[PDB]
Design a protein around this ligand. Structure first.
Ligand SMILES: CCCCCCCC/C=C/CCCCCCCCOC(=O)[C@H](O)CO
Ligand SMILES: CCCCCCCC/C=C\CCCCCCCCOC(=O)[C@H](O)CO
Ligand SMILES: CCCCCCCC/C=C\CCCCCCCCOC(=O)[C@H](O)CO
Ligand SMILES: CCCCCCCC/C=C\CCCCCCCCOC(=O)[C@H](O)CO
Ligand SMILES: CCCCCCCC/C=C\CCCCCCCCOC(=O)[C@H](O)CO
Ligand SMILES: CCCCCCCC/C=C\CCCCCCCCOC(=O)[C@H](O)CO
Ligand SMILES: *C/C=C(C)/C=C/C=C(C)/C=C/C1=C(C)CCCC1(C)C
Ligand SMILES: CCCCCCCCO[C@@H]1O[C@H](CO)[C@@H](O)[C@H](O)[C@H]1O
Ligand SMILES: CCCCCCCCO[C@@H]1O[C@H](CO)[C@@H](O)[C@H](O)[C@H]1O
Ligand SMILES: CCCCCCCCO[C@@H]1O[C@H](CO)[C@@H](O)[C@H](O)[C@H]1O
Ligand SMILES: CCCCCCCCO[C@@H]1O[C@H](CO)[C@@H](O)[C@H](O)[C@H]1O
Ligand SMILES: CCCCCCCCO[C@@H]1O[C@H](CO)[C@@H](O)[C@H](O)[C@H]1O
Ligand SMILES: CCCCCCCCO[C@@H]1O[C@H](CO)[C@@H](O)[C@H](O)[C@H]1O
Ligand SMILES: CCCCCCCCO[C@@H]1O[C@H](CO)[C@H](O)[C@@H](O)[C@H]1O
Ligand SMILES: CCCCCCCCO[C@@H]1O[C@H](CO)[C@H](O)[C@@H](O)[C@H]1O
Ligand SMILES: [Cl-]
Length: 212
């Protein structure tokens, strides 16, 4: 009743609507949000059209998903870094930590043997370091800003930390890991998370930009 392609089209539409909404409201932050959801829109369309479905051993890996993540997640971290007022050196640490997470996940998905769990573990370790920087140094830094900016940062940070922490569990329980969850359920869960961590993220920012 509900196929993989239908789910991909749903993600595509959701990202498209977010993209147009952000572009209009911007008639730096607004341009970043267009990139976050705009890139994801393209990845989902490609996947909806059946492009980039790589067979690996016994499972199917969706390559556009990881290219999406590698480009859009640093933009989310960048957005949060601007809110917190990071110096260009602090940016380098967190964006480097982020890229290690994304690359490790991409590589582990593409490896058929058990070495893929070794790649997954390395992404997990780097993710814990990324969480430390969001909850600590970047929160210290955001404190120096107005009360409204600091409030916005804390809200987006909380959304980001809680939801991003769920992805490694979905990956591990799905086809890439112990292939418990079926591809359809696993995809459905990730489409939901992608939409909330990108389009939901964006709309919470828009809401605060009008409350000024
Ligand atoms: C715009 C954000 C600016 C911040 C970004 C910071 C650094 C981003 C890191 C980029 C390196 C990503 C490499 C992409 C992998 C391409 C393999 C593609 O190969 C393939 O096609 C698959 O193997 C197919 O199965
Ligand atoms: C300065 C005041 C600004 C006030 C706000 C005005 C916003 C008007 C401009 C853009 C609206 C963006 C929402 C996208 C609607 C497209 C739905 C199109 O319907 C669909 O989604 C199709 O069925 C499939 O894509
Ligand atoms: C250390 C600090 C250095 C500062 C680094 C800044 C990095 C980020 C800078 C600008 C954000 C890039 C936005 C990309 C928009 C293009 C996607 C467009 O997406 C699309 O494909 C279409 O929209 C599809 O409809
Ligand atoms: C001031 C802003 C500066 C921004 C700097 C961002 C640069 C970060 C770039 C690359 C980080 C590479 C980490 C390599 C681990 C990837 C594991 C996956 O790789 C592998 O496992 C093997 O290579 C595959 O054979
Ligand atoms: C039967 C084959 C699969 C069963 C067990 C492999 C270890 C699973 C560890 C899950 C947590 C990743 C973290 O664990 C790891 O990264 C391990 O060091 C992989 O070697
Ligand atoms: C703060 C005040 C308003 C921003 C929160 C509303 C976000 C609505 C769009 C969620 C984005 O849409 C979604 O994630 C759907 O639930 C997916 O089915
Ligand atoms: C818009 C897309 C988003 C916010 C995607 C987020 C994805 C993650 C936080 C994934 C994290 C992972 C780990 C922590 C370990 C390795 C496997 C990953 C890539 C699923
Ligand atoms: C390429 C032609 C295939 C179109 O396919 C359709 O595209 C729509 C996207 O706007 C989706 O809403 C539909 O679910 C999908 O079946
Ligand atoms: C500052 C004006 C609003 C933000 C401009 C975003 C610049 C990136 O390009 C954007 O691509 C989108 C479609 O791919 C369009 O919807 C935007 O209008 C376009 O500006
Ligand atoms: C004058 C109104 C400008 C609208 C916002 C700036 C548009 C930025 O344009 C974007 O810049 C990127 C390079 O960083 C390119 O890769 C993108 O393709 C391009 O759309
Ligand atoms: C804004 C327009 C961006 C267009 C990006 C489309 C990317 C999908 O391009 C795809 O790349 C594959 C490479 O093997 C080919 O097999 C597919 O035929 C092709 O559709
Ligand atoms: C060669 C490996 C498969 C990738 C190429 C086949 C693409 C099949 O998909 C087609 O791609 C087109 C891209 O514009 C779409 O317009 C069509 O609606 C779609 O049916
Ligand atoms: C069959 C033996 C494994 C097949 C190839 C495993 C793929 C690991 O190579 C991966 O390719 C891409 C290159 O940047 C990225 O995903 C990763 O950086 C890299 O680890
Ligand atoms: C901009 C983000 C979307 C980029 C996704 C492009 C992924 C292309 O991926 C390709 O798809 C084809 C399968 O149909 C090829 O045959 C595969 O080998 C694969 O490399
Ligand atoms: C946002 C949409 C929610 C849909 C939740 C997923 C429920 C459908 O999950 C089912 O899984 C089976 C395999 O596991 C079938 O093969 C699928 O056709 C699908 O019907
Ligand atoms: Cl996958």
């Amino acid at each position: 009743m509900v196929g993989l392609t239908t789910l991909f089209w749903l993600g595509a539409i959701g990202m498209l609507v977010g993209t147009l909404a952000f572009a209009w409201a911007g008639r730096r932050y607004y341009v970043t949000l267009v990139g976050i959801s705009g890139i994801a829109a393209v990845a989902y369309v490609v996947m909806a059209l059946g492009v980039g479905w790589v067979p690996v051993a016994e499972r199917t890996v969706f390559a556009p998903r990881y290219i999406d993540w590698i480009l859009t997640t640093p933009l989310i971290v960048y957005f949060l870094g601007l809110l917190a007022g990071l110096d260009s050196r602090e940016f380098g640490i967190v964006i480097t930590l982020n890229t290690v997470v994304m690359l490790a996940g991409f590589a582990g998905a593409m490896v058929p043997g058990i070495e893929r769990y070794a790649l997954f573990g390395m992404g997990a370790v780097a993710f814990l370091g990324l969480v430390y920087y969001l909850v600590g140094p970047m929160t210290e830094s955001a404190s120096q800003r107005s009360s409204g900016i600091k409030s916005l940062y804390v809200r987006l940070r909380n959304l980001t930390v809680i939801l991003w922490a769920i992805y490694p569990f979905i990956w591990l329980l799905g086809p890439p890991g112990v292939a418990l969850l079926t591809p359809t359920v696993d995809v459905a869960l990730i489409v939901y998370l992608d939409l909330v961590t990108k389009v939901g993220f964006g709309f919470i920012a828009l809401d605060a930009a009008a409350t000024l």
